Each structure stands twice: as C-alpha cells, then as structure tokens.
Design a protein around this ligand. Structure first.
Ligand SMILES: Nc1ncnc2c1ncn2[C@H]1C[C@H](O)[C@@H](COP(=O)(O)[C@H](F)P(=O)(O)OP(=O)(O)O)O1
Ligand SMILES: [Cl-]
Ligand SMILES: [Cl-]
Ligand SMILES: [Cl-]
Ligand SMILES: [Cl-]
Ligand SMILES: [Mg+2]
Ligand SMILES: [Mg+2]
Ligand code: NA
Ligand code: NA
Length: 326
DNA sequence: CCGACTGCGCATCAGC
DNA sequence: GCTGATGCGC
DNA sequence: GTCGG
C-alpha cells in the first residue's frame, strides 16, 4: 500500500474509461500503470519519478503530480459528481451488466438497485442472478472458506470419477488470504487435444455439485466452461454463508501446464507475459505456446512439460504463483 | 508519427 | 438453422 | 494512454 493513493486513482480512471467512455485501450493502459506502480518498492515522491516506470506516460505523470500536491484529481472529482457517469458506473457492478447495457438502462431511466429490482423482466438470465446476489458478490472470501470450498469440490469430483483432477487456481493458488471467487481447473484422461472419448465431462461434475446443493445457480455453461454460483453448507442455527461466484474450466489433460498457467493469473500477469512472448516471437494461450512465423501466423504447439518450460521459451526466469500477483 | 495493444468461452443478435 | 459480430466475463 | 521502431 506504499502508493495506495495513486494506484486507487488510476484504477478509478481505468474503470471510468472502460465503463463510461467505452475506451478499452485506455482502460488497459491505466490498469497497466496502476500495476507497475503497485509493485514499485518506494513511496513515489513525484510524477517524474513515476514516469521512469514502463507504462506510465506524460499524462499519468501529470495526474500523479496533481494527486501528490492536492490529494485528489479534479478530473475524478467531476466524474464523481456526474450523474450519468455515476449511474453507469453503478449498474456495471451487477454481474452481466457491462458498459453497453449499463448505458442502455440509464437511457431507459433504470439507474438504481430499486429500478433494477422492479424491472427484473428487462434482464437476461445472467443479469437476473447478478442482481439476486448483488451484495454477496461484492463480499471477499476468506481463505479459510476457500479451503472448505476446495475440500467439497475435490471430494465431489472424486465421487463422480477418481480419474478427474480438479485444481483451484486464480488468486487462491497465488496464496491470497482472500479471493473474489473460486476458480477450478478440471481435467479428465478422456478429454485431450487428441480426442473427446467421453461426453458431458463438465456437465457430470456440475450436476453432482448441484445434487449436493453446493452449486446453486448458473450464469452460463458450455462444454468447457461453467460460470455460476455456489454456497458452503452452514450448521444448525448458524447464519448462512454468502453465495459465491464459481468458475470451472475443463482443459485437455495434455495441455494442463498451459491451462494452469492461464487460470493461475493474475489477469495482468497473463497480459504482461503474453505480450512479452509476442516480443520473443511466440504466442501463448491456455492451451499451447506456439512460435510466430516470419509472416505472423502462429506455428505448431511446442512441447510443454511444466509451467517452467513456458517461462523458459520466452526467456523469463521462473516465477512462483505467489509472485504472479500483478 | 502511428500502428498496435493477451487471448478466448458462452450468450445473444443480425443477416441470410 | 448457420455464421460472424458484439457484449460480457475468465 | 503508452510505447517501439
Ligand atoms: N483478462 C484476462 N486475460 C488473461 N487471463 C485472464 C484474464 N482474466 C482472468 N484471467 C485468468 C487469470 C486469472 O487469475 C484467472 C481467474 O480469473 P478471475 O476473474 O477469477 C480473477 F482475475 P483472480 O486472479 O482469480 O482474482 P479474484 O478472483 O479477484 O480473487 O483467469
Ligand atoms: Cl481506447
Ligand atoms: Cl481523487
Ligand atoms: Cl501444456
Ligand atoms: Cl491453441
Ligand atoms: Mg478468481
Ligand atoms: Mg473467476
Ligand atoms: Na514510462
Ligand atoms: Na458487471
């Protein structure tokens, strides 16, 4: 939290750009600058000092100079007092309502939690569930509950088939003391890049988790990705736990290392690492790392036997999950 | 200056 | 129905 | 909004 003030500011700016301006590159630029400043081991004394860091330019340096001198950013003060921006920023806090739907709702005069609630018939399924659990989804999950959650998921997956392997990734795998949700990487020997020797692999797991009342709602579901809602069981007389977001990703077993690298994150670490790969003439996704041809076309997938192999290709010293929280 | 900016699954919609 | 674009979120 | 060439 050395520079909590500055990173907060930049994060607020990134949000404004994504949510209100619908300017995706500015959003990514701001997140990048916030992230680099967050890891900088010194209390930033000036914009010029910040500007030394990759991803901080003249505009951000200037904002940092304003923020340091006054403690705030006029630009942000104004954004905050603007009803349309405020409203749009609020509606996007509901899962399933993004920048476009937010602006549409505000046009229609839907702009409060109350409005949303009385106009449920105007929401798609995802949005309806997001409204349902609006409060819960903004709560953090203590690692201690994540551990309980992990135990359930792992045991129920075992019950469906001992050959499944379920791994909890995301912030949990990076060692975080609290998580925004639970991310589960799933593999089965029957699903490889070579074939799918068994159908409903993901469905069967989802069903079992529903059967035991752990998964409570579904945001979306396909053959390889599930997005939904879950809840720990409480005890006699005890208040219930908040409902939690859960994501499950089924990945070809032979592509586990690329998959776990992807699902471990952080999102910015991934973006950073993937960008570096391109600079070294590779492209990395959750399945494969491939070379780029002179033309620019991705070539064939390279041999991968560990996460470190991936780092090796792009000439990065290996970084443990706990050190990928950018 | 200016092109490029990480990479992709699922839901929904237009156009055919 | 399909495909391809766009929204949303990982 | 930033950067590399
Ligand atoms: N934009 C992205 N680009 C690349 N990989 C991504 C991206 N977004 C997510 N992933 C990968 C890398 C992410 O780590 C992983 C899970 O995405 P979560 O949305 O659950 C989120 F970021 P987590 O890190 O888990 O933190 P918490 O959930 O707040 O506690 O998917
Ligand atoms: Cl932009
Ligand atoms: Cl401010
Ligand atoms: Cl792999
Ligand atoms: Cl691939
Ligand atoms: Mg997560
Ligand atoms: Mg997630
Ligand atoms: Na810089
Ligand atoms: Na949202």
């Amino acid at each position: 939290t050395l520079n909590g003030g500055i990173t907060d500011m930049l994060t607020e700016l990134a949000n404004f750009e994504k949510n209100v301006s619908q300017a995706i590159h500015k959003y990514n630029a701001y997140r990048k600058a916030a992230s680099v400043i967050a890891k900088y081991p010194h209390k930033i004394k000036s914009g010029a000092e910040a500007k030394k860091l990759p991803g901080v330019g003249t505009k951000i340096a200037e904002k940092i100079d304003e923020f340091l001198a006054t403690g705030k950013l006029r630009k942000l003060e104004k954004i905050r007092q603007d009803d349309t921006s405020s409203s749009i920023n609020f509606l996007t806090r509901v899962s399933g309502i993004g920048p476009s739907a937010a602006r549409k709702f505000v046009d229609e005069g839907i702009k409060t939690l109350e409005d949303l609630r009385k106009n449920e018939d105007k929401l798609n399924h995802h949005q309806r569930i997001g409204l349902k659990y609006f409060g819960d989804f903004e709560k953090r999950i203590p690692r201690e509950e994540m551990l309980q959650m992990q135990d359930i998921v792992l045991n129920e997956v075992k019950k469906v088939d001992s050959e499944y392997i379920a791994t909890v990734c995301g912030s949990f795998r990076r060692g975080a003391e609290s998580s925004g949700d639970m991310d589960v990487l799933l593999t089965h020997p029957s699903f490889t890049s070579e074939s799918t020797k068994q159908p409903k692999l993901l469905h069967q797991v989802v069903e079992q988790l529903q059967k035991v009342h752990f998964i409570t709602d579904t945001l979306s579901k396909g053959e390889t990705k599930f997005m939904g809602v879950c809840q720990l069981p409480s005890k006699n007389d005890e208040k219930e736990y908040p409902h939690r977001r859960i994501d499950i990703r089924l990945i070809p077993k032979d592509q586990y290392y690329c998959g776990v690298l992807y699902f471990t994150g952080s999102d910015i670490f991934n973006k950073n690492m993937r960008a570096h790969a391109l600079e070294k003439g590779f492209t990395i996704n959750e399945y494969t790392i491939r070379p780029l041809g002179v033309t620019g076309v991705a070539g064939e997938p390279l041999p991968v036997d560990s996460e470190k192999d991936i780092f090796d290709y792009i000439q990065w010293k290996y970084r443990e999950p706990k050190d990928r929280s950018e």
